[PDB]
Amino acid sequence: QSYNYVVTAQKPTAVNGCVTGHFTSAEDLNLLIAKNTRLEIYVVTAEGLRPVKEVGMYGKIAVMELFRPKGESKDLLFILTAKYNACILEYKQSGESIDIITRAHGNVQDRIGRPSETGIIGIIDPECRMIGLRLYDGLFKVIPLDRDNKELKAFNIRLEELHVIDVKFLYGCQAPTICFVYQDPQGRHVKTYEVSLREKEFNKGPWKQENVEAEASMVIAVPEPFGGAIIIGQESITYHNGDKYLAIAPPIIKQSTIVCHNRVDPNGSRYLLGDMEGRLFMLLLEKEEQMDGTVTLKDLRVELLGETSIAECLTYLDNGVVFVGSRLGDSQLVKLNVDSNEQGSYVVAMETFTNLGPIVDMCVVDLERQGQGQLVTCSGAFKEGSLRIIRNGIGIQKLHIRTVPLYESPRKICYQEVSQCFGVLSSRIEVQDTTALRPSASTQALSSSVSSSKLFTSFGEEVEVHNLLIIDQHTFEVLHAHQFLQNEYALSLVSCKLGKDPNTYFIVGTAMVYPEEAEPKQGRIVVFQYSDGKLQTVAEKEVKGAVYSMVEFNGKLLASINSTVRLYEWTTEKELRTECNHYNNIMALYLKTKGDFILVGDLMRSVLLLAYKPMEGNFEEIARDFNPNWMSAVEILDDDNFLGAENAFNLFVCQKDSAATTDEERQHLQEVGLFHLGEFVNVFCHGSLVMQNLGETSTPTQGSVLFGTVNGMIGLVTSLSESWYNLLLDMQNRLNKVIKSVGKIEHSFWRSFHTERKTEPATGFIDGDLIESFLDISRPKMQEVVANLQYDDGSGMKREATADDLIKVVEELTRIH
Amino acid sequence: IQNQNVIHRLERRRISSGKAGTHWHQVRVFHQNVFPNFTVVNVEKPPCFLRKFSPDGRYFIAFSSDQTSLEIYEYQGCQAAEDLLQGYEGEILSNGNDQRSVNIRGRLFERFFVLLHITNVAANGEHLNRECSLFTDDCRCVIVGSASPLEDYSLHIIDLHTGRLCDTRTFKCDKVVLSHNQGLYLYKNILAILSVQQQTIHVFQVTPEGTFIDVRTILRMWKMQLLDENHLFIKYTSFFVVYNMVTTEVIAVFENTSDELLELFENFCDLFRNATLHSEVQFPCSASSNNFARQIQRRFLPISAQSYSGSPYLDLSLFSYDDKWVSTCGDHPIRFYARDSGLLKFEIQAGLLRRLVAFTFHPFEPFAISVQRTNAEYVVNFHMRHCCT
Amino acid sequence: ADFLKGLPVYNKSNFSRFHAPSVYLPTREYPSEQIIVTEKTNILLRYLHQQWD
């Protein structure tokens, strides 16, 4: 039916979690980084980070903990995946050969149980007695770390609280004691329990429940001799240890929320904190010794050290070097200095690590007109927002990324070849008096304009100012900046000729956004012409809703205003005029076209295929997918195959069943392909990053669709012939036997389609990573794979395959990316 | 004040997928933006008794006027009638004298539901039970039944996609409470039938292809529930018993007023409910799993099969609403406010602008029907999302 | 800044020569010593069995 081939051009780059320990031996200090499905292992040396290994896992790493139980010479690594595959791994080395063995593996998924709002939480006792997992509301799963038993019996303890914010294991307890923050109708409180493995229960905790700040959201376990725990909220920081209780409310931290923390000293005298604005604080615990030699807390003191990237995770490595793992921007290796620099900051950056995520929008442009596609992406958010230009080539061929920082959030991008410029929607945050928080690109433009439309909050609130930026294509300098009306958000952006008008216009769909209203009730379709270095509002149309997406459709304007898909004609007086409407939608978020066909991707109703009838001047619903899915991107592979990425990290392909006999059966699209990508796809676009020379006609694939995801991943989807699909599916089945997985997760289980409503094995898709991994296994193993396999050598008949045949076949497959 | 506007949530979703395991709530919160904000009154309705949607929501079940044939419709979606309502800005479509209003009320039902199959299953003078309907985990088939006096009872399994009757069992002398799935229970392709007159519990597993295979046959029994494939929960009269049919051992007994029984129910009401067994990712709402649900329960068995819809608008984690009417006729419309800010979001009203009332929500879509029933007269209204553009 | 002296040091030479990876392809079948199995019976019935004791 559908024969697709999915491969990765750029591996995920967004850092999800960072840990440090003694993993490779008892003497190396290892930094372990989880980039979605990847686990990177570096050794801290005199030269910095020495990349030692990289492990691909068959799941999304949610938890990463290093623990060294008694009787172990070095650390074991616990990894839980998003499909609940749990694996305890040991790093083993035999000189030149590195073996990452799986000490234990299992699946800890529970069929019944509501996923918690705050997500998967995995903690390990300081004495390495147990692993605790918060996966569902009112349940705590305990995995005891025994040695003699053949099986690790993980059991559940009923957790009385139902809304847990954060859990931790306390230090200095003769029994494993947990401390957690929970929310109830009475507010937020902090509680402690003790884990009894024999009774399989929770006994009363060491110290009492306490009412805490309304925004208390982080729990830190302070090691001995201090003990206790620090509860961190939005406006105050508290310390609780039995009857001992301290609390401070520093005015410096009130601006934004602290999201990550790390322990600097082994005894917990100093902690690192990072907040959403990108600032780095040092929490200090001042100790006082009693006459009997005991050590007790005296006061808490917070200092501001400077600004870093927006930190998803922090990890103090050594000698004042801190790894700032960023999700919205480039990760960093930064150094804390004793004395501040000229700018009054103790923090000085040393190294930066590229992060393409979140890829919010992207376009394929032949900038140099050499016939090769370059990818221009709107990456990052807040002060990290930028444009990334991605080329394929030699500095072997790799991907080369150039960064153009904007210091504000880019939303949409479109390319206007006649003007030799890009149009970028962007937004920035201002404090209501409104004043800009920091200088950005929308404020350093050479020339700027403000909306003059007359067609249409408390102190301290944050308001978004949206701008349309005209950006040069050579220097990537912000030529022009157009600030829209107050409380107006620019959502969609297209660049097209309209009607018989020879002028190329930028077209922006906007909306009026107020916090109390659930949905926009007004919007504008504004047609600008960028000429003479100046942007002028050629036309503007008031519409009754947010213009979510617009695409040029055979010289007309196809727009989506709330649940309406409207067609506009560009008249002779150069104003828009409605031609036809299609109202049957919940929310027409995504629009694609091919010929006279429109693929509408809805918020929750999957895809729908309409056709414009030229001789009637109206739409007609050709067919629609009746399986509900939460789309995030749509694409039309060909006239009968429609691709779609949904919310739970899955890809599917629907087919216009032309073989149906009744018009009723032709109204349904059949889900001919299912696949679990493991990424949230933001953008699909037709194109390729490689040279499409005349000699490339020998490729067995047809089509090429790039997709950009939140985690900085870039992937490629192509189509195979039936015989090629069969051959590569046989390859898949045999490689699933030859290659053993880290953590021992079955590839078929990993790639299986899995949503809130259904779970089916992947069909009509060929994992390109697994197929390309065939080229690097040992030659005896290749003989094992190729053995007894039947191959069509090209003479029209089938023979016994040889290694060179399938080597050249796969070599041809890897020439598509 | 927090940003409730859907555009904020869309942009936030684009730039971030949240922590691991949270991507389900990132879309569950969208039901606070898109809701059934419009109501059409007194829609023309075919001669059939509507029952409910399938767990996946694709199909709709009705019982014909002959009470011997089952009607299977395909649900076209909650946007199926958007074009008919243009220009009618407002919250309700008042029952008026204008020809457009009566035209809309005459076209709406056929817009929303399309007849697929009419399968005559009843025979020998038996009649289908109005309230008996169970669905398989794959949602490929539906379980129906047909019939203090005693009569011959019959159970059938019907493929929904194709309409073909798959399998049927008969019981010459049987007394089962087929109404509201009282004498029937389904859990993970395990079907249990409860014969009160014969003091019997009978077990089968159902095949994915839709056939019955016998498993086993086992103060007085009153009702039944199945905790899992290894444990029954029986009533006696009251006394509750949890028992194992594999080991034939009584596990536990309880008195109806016992306190440890009450606390265990408070602890595992979710496990007793089995709201959304038809999928691996579940979102139950009960006193056992929600702050507000436990608050209402504390401020104030056995559970019927599939009795709880998984509608997100009925989820207390998202919407504040009065608990009296929806989990006689409601004297007032039911209002739904947001949990985050408390602002009013949408009203639902079953009455024309005592009588029995019934409310049906789509398991996920912003669509609902309301039925008012009397001794001989019915009236149905449609609540659905609507915008004017 | 008196709060930044004496930062923890593991090796005095780490990052002292700083200036501004191979994929692991497992092929040898190494059998896992333990397997992480969950309690097959759910929490309610497990609690009932425990209380039966």
Swiss-Prot record, chain A:
The modification Phosphothreonine is found at residue 802. One of its GO terms (cellular component) is cytoplasm. The modification N6-acetyllysine is found at residue 744. Phosphorylated by ABL1. Ubiquitinated by CUL4A. Subsequently degraded by ubiquitin-dependent proteolysis. The keyword Acetylation applies. Pathway: Protein modification; protein ubiquitination. Keywords: Acetylation, Biological rhythms, Cytoplasm, Disease variant, DNA damage, DNA repair, DNA-binding, Host-virus interaction, Intellectual disability, Isopeptide bond, Nucleus, Phosphoprotein, Repeat, Ubl conjugation, Ubl conjugation pathway. Its main location: cytoplasm. One of its GO terms (molecular function) is protein-containing complex binding. The modification N-acetylserine is found at residue 2. It is found in: Cytoplasm; Nucleus. Residues 13-356 are annotated as: WD repeat beta-propeller A. There is a cross-link at residue 798 (Glycyl lysine isopeptide (Lys-Gly) (interchain with G-Cter in SUMO2)). Residues 398-720 are annotated as: WD repeat beta-propeller C. Residues 456-817 are annotated as: Interaction with CDT1 and CUL4A. The keyword Iron-sulfur does not apply. It is linked to White-Kernohan syndrome: An autosomal dominant disorder characterized by global developmental delay, variably impaired intellectual development, hypotonia, and characteristic facial features. Some patients may have genitourinary and skeletal abnormalities. Belongs to the DDB1 family. The core of the protein consists of three WD40 beta-propeller domains. Component of the UV-DDB complex which includes DDB1 and DDB2; the heterodimer dimerizes to give rise to a heterotetramer when bound to damaged DNA. The UV-DDB complex interacts with monoubiquitinated histone H2A and binds to XPC via the DDB2 subunit. Component of numerous DCX (DDB1-CUL4-X-box) E3 ubiquitin-protein ligase complexes which consist of a core of DDB1, CUL4A or CUL4B and RBX1. DDB1 may recruit specific substrate targeting subunits to the DCX complex. This is DNA damage-binding protein 1.
From Swiss-Prot, chain B:
GO terms for molecular function: protein-containing complex binding; ubiquitin protein ligase binding; ubiquitin-like ligase-substrate adaptor activity. GO terms for biological process: positive regulation of proteasomal ubiquitin-dependent protein catabolic process; protein ubiquitination; protein-containing complex assembly. Highly expressed in the ovary, some lymphoid organs and resting leukocytes. Its main location: nucleus. GO terms for cellular component: Cul4-RING E3 ubiquitin ligase complex; Cul4A-RING E3 ubiquitin ligase complex; cullin-RING ubiquitin ligase complex; nucleus. It comes from the Eukaryota. It is found in: Nucleus. It holds the Pfam family Det1. Keywords: Nucleus, Ubl conjugation pathway. Belongs to the DET1 family. Component of the DCX DET1-COP1 ubiquitin ligase complex at least composed of RBX1, DET1, DDB1, CUL4A and COP1. Component of the E3 ubiquitin ligase DCX DET1-COP1 complex, which is required for ubiquitination and subsequent degradation of target proteins. The complex is involved in JUN ubiquitination and degradation. This is DET1 homolog. It comes from Homo sapiens. The gene is DET1.
Curated annotation (Swiss-Prot), chain C:
Pathway: Protein modification; protein ubiquitination. GO terms for cellular component: Cul4-RING E3 ubiquitin ligase complex; nucleoplasm. Keywords: Acetylation, Phosphoprotein, Ubl conjugation pathway. The keyword Repressor does not apply. The modification Phosphoserine is found at residue 22. The modification N-acetylalanine is found at residue 1. The keyword GTP-binding does not apply. One of its GO terms (biological process) is positive regulation of proteasomal ubiquitin-dependent protein catabolic process. Belongs to the DDA1 family. Component of numerous DCX (DDB1-CUL4-X-box) E3 ubiquitin-protein ligase complexes which consist of a core of DDB1, cullin-4 (CUL4A or CUL4B), DDA1 and RBX1. Component of the DCX(DCAF15) complex, also named CLR4(DCAF15) complex, composed of DCAF15, DDB1, cullin-4 (CUL4A or CUL4B), DDA1 and RBX1. Part of the DDD core complex containing DET1, DDA1 and DDB1; the DDD core complex recruits a specific UBE2E enzyme, such as UBE2E1, UBE2E2 UBE2E3, to form specific DDD-E2 complexes. Functions as a component of numerous distinct DCX (DDB1-CUL4-X-box) E3 ubiquitin-protein ligase complexes which mediate the ubiquitination and subsequent proteasomal degradation of target proteins. In the DCX complexes, acts as a scaffolding subunit required to stabilize the complex. This is DET1- and DDB1-associated protein 1. The chain holds residues 2 to 64 of 102 of the full protein.
